[PDB]
């Protein structure tokens, strides 16, 4: 069985791509790349596609659980929020790709123990003003879920303890921007 059966993932996942075409609406710029539910198929997908650090600025990858679209408006996201990692241009070179891979590994490997069920997906934004990586969770009011996820994610990324990351609710983000919206939680 180990000799010939692929290793099943707890969840089936969908990888999405966003390209910044300024002539189309945000939603219209969203493209489904592929779905997978094994370790082997994940790697086949990962080895085939551009590293985030090689994407044109304005583009995104999203990895979301199958059945959850990578937008605030989805039922699984509307009450949720994101743990946000903000990177400068030096970090594009040194941290972006390794941080994004590690984030993928946390999702597909169900690394958040009990609270992995609260995870919806993750998004990497490649941007001239600073790249971002974020884990989206389902319920901003699940304080224990949100804190456990944040703390494990920070540890897995290997961020020095002194480096604080914030959690932003989507509702707040929707009426402001990523760098004007306030933190509901920190870790």
């Amino acid at each position: 069985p180990e000799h010939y059966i692929k290793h099943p993932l707890q969840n089936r996942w969908a990888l999405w791509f966003f390209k910044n075409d300024k002539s189309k609406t945000w939603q219209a710029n969203l493209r489904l790349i592929s779905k997978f539910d094994t370790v082997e198929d994940f790697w086949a997908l990962y080895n085939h596609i551009q590293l985030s650090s090689n994407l044109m600025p304005g583009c995104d990858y999203s990895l979301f659980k199958d059945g959850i679209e990578p937008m605030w408006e989805d039922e699984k996201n509307k009450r949720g929020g994101r743990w946000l990692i903000t990177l400068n241009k030096q970090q594009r070179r040194s941290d972006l790709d390794r941080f994004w891979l590690e984030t993928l590994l946390c999702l597909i490997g169900e690394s958040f123990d009990d609270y992995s069920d609260d995870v919806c997906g993750a998004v990497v934004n490649v941007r001239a003003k600073g790249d971002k990586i974020a884990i989206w969770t389902t319920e901003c009011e699940n304080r224990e879920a949100v804190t456990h996820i944040g703390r494990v994610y920070k540890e897995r990324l290997g961020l020095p303890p002194k480096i604080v990351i914030g959690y932003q609710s989507h509702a707040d983000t929707a009426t402001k921007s990523g760098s004007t919206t306030k933190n509901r939680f920190v870790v």
Binding site: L9, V39, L105, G109
Partner: peptide, 13 residues
């Protein structure tokens, strides 16, 4: 339920 640690997943690349 189905949980994979980091070194296991990275073994498959």
């Amino acid at each position: 339920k189905k949980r994979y640690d980091r070194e296991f997943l990275l073994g498959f690349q």
